[PDB]
Amino acid sequence: TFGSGEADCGLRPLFEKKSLEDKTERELLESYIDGR
Amino acid sequence: IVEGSDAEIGMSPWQVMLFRKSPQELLCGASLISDRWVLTAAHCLLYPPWDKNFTENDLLVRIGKHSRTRYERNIEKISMLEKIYIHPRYNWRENLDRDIALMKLKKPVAFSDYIHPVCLPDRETAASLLQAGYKGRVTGWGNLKETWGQPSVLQVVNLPIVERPVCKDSTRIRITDNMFCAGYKPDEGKRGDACEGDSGGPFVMKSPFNNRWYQMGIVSWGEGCDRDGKYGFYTHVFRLKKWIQKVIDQFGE
Amino acid sequence: XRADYEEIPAAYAX
Numbered sequence: 001t002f003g004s005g006e007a008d009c010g011l012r013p014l015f016e017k018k019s020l021e022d023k024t025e026r027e028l029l030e031s032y033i034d035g036r
Numbered sequence: 037i038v039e040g041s042d043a044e045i046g047m048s049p050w051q052v053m054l055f056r057k058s059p060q061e062l063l064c065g066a067s068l069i070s071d072r073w074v075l076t077a078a079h080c081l082l083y084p085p086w087d088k089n090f091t092e093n094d095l096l097v098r099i100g101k102h103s104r105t106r107y108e109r110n111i112e113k114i115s116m117l118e119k120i121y122i123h124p125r126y127n128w129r130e131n132l133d134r135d136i137a138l139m140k141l142k143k144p145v146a147f148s149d150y151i152h153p154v155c156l157p158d159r160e161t162a163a164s165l166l167q168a169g170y171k172g173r174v175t176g177w178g179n180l181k182e183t184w185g186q187p188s189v190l191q192v193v194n195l196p197i198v199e200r201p202v203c204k205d206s207t208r209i210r211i212t213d214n215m216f217c218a219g220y221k222p223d224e225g226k227r228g229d230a231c232e233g234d235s236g237g238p239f240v241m242k243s244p245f246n247n248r249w250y251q252m253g254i255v256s257w258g259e260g261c262d263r264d265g266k267y268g269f270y271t272h273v274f275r276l277k278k279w280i281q282k283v284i285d286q287f288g289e
Numbered sequence: 290x291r292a293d294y295e296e297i298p299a300a301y302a303x
């Protein structure tokens with residue numbers, strides 16, 4: 001609803017919240033020279 | 037989406053469907069940024085060179101979807117719009133400068149396993165992630181091929197952010213600071229792009245500092261789909277953040 | 290701009 005989107009914004013119920021990784025996010029993380 | 041793959045269930049719970057009341061048909065994409073606020077591209081709603089001029093009443097918004105055609109019973113939600121807002125200085129005449137718009141839903145939507153909003157960048161996040169060679173992700177129910185069929189379920193593709201000058205040297209359209217372009221170069225092997233039907237959608241990034249997904253861009257314009265030597269243009273959400281803050285502040289949330 | 294749907298139950302059509 002504003003800066004930084006929301007309060008619980010950005011954390012996926014079926015992933016982040018369950019500590020599950022989707023099939024392609026490593027790709028991203030790695031592009032940042034090194035995600036972590 | 038061209039050269040993408042099938043999205044897993046619950047992979048983008050913010051994704052939204054601009055749906056044409058009648059003829060009942062898909063319009064564009066958009067995204068959930070709050071319980072009452074949708075975000076899209078102005079050209080989805082208005083584009084006079086084509087008599088495109090929609091109203092609050094002309095359309096339907098569907099959230100929590102995977103399947104393109106099926107009415108996903110007990111999973112998907114449908115809402116109606118209260119009021120539509122376009123950037124006052126949106127340049128439809130020349131180059132789509134400031135292609136952005138806000139939509140306010142009739143009633144607030146309840147979150148679920150399949151429905152959840154995304155975050156909007158801050159100067160820092162924005163500074164830190166908005167860099168060349170960095171990858172973002174695009175989603176949508178648009179075409180799979182430039183000219184020809186259509187997809188069955190939501191498709192996904194991750195692309196790298198390209199350098200200003202390359203973008204600039206890629207076309208004859210006059211480019212502004214409220215844009216960025218994305219995709220692979222030709223010497224890269226890899227392909228992929230958005231296409232008709234993806235517009236208004238979200239271009240996103242995951243923060244490596246706090247793990248959240250942020251919306252950095254809105255699918256804006258381009259020339260063809262996945263043409264070699266070509267890139268997709270995106271509205272620079274951060275640069276338009278103040279406008280959004282306002283309208284949200286002034287209009288209730 | 291880059292220069293068959295299953296029915297919906299009317300109940301929604303305001």
Ligand SMILES: *[C@@H]1O[C@H](CO)[C@@H](O)[C@H](O)C1NC(C)=O
Pocket residue numbers: 082084089090091
């Ligand atoms: C879209 O249609 C409106 C009313 O429902 C207008 O008042 C408005 O001027 C518009 N777009 C124009 C034609 O560019």
